[PDB]
Structures are given as C-alpha cells and as structure tokens.
Amino acid sequence: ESCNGLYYQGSCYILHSDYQMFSDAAANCTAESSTLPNKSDVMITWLIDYVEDTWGSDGNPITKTTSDSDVSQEVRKYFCVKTMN
C-alpha cells in the first residue's frame, strides 16, 4: 500500500509535475531506478486518462489513439514507473 500514485499490474506510476524535455524526463526516471510508461501497457486501461500527454518511453507523448509531429522541442510532465513488492 506504499504506492503514492497509480498502482496497476504490480507497478507503481509516480507523477512528476515538472515539465521536461523528453531526454531529461527519461534520465530523471532512470535515476530513480524507473522507466517512463509504455504506450502499450496503458492504452485500454483506466490509467490512460492520467498518462495521456505525458512522456512515453518511445520519445512521444502518450495518446488514446495510435497516431503516426515535431515534438523534440516540447516539454511535458511524466510518470516514472517501478515494479512493486
């Protein structure tokens, strides 16, 4: 019960409200022994409402759709994911 955030499939998603360019968000999660969410793990889950528009592990914001836009100059929030237990 020590997950202060979204808990799903034995993993804890912690919200980081600071806007960051993708690389910085990625490194920040790596520093906390975590990774960014994977679009495939969250689509079709109640988590999608929280993670959409936040950095996905593939360098793109997570979206409800399965899109195909220059986003390298953008900043967004992100969730760092870590397995529980």
Curated annotation (Swiss-Prot):
Gene Ontology CC annotations of this record: host cell membrane; membrane; viral envelope; virion membrane
Compartment annotation: Virion membrane; Host membrane
UniProt keyword annotations, A-Z: Disulfide bond, Glycoprotein, Host membrane, Membrane, Signal-anchor, Transmembrane, Transmembrane helix, Viral envelope protein, Virion
Keyword check for Lipoprotein: no
Region (C-type lectin-like domain): 1-85
Glycan-linked positions: 28, 38
Main location: virion
Keyword rRNA processing on entry: no
Sequence ranges on the Virion surface membrane side: 1-85
Function noted in UniProt: Forms a complex with OPG162 and OPG190 to coordinate the incorporation of OPG164 into wrapped enveloped virion (EV) membranes and, subsequently, the production of actin tails. Therefore plays an essential role in efficient cell-to-cell spread of viral particles.
Stated family: Belongs to the orthopoxvirus OPG161 family.
Subunit structure and binding partners: Homodimer, disulfide-linked. Interacts with protein OPG190. Interacts (via C-terminus) with protein OPG164. Interacts with OPG162.
Record protein name field: Protein OPG161
Organism from which the protein derives: Vaccinia virus (strain Western Reserve) (VACV)
Designated gene of the protein: OPG161
Residues of the full protein shown: 98 to 185 of 185
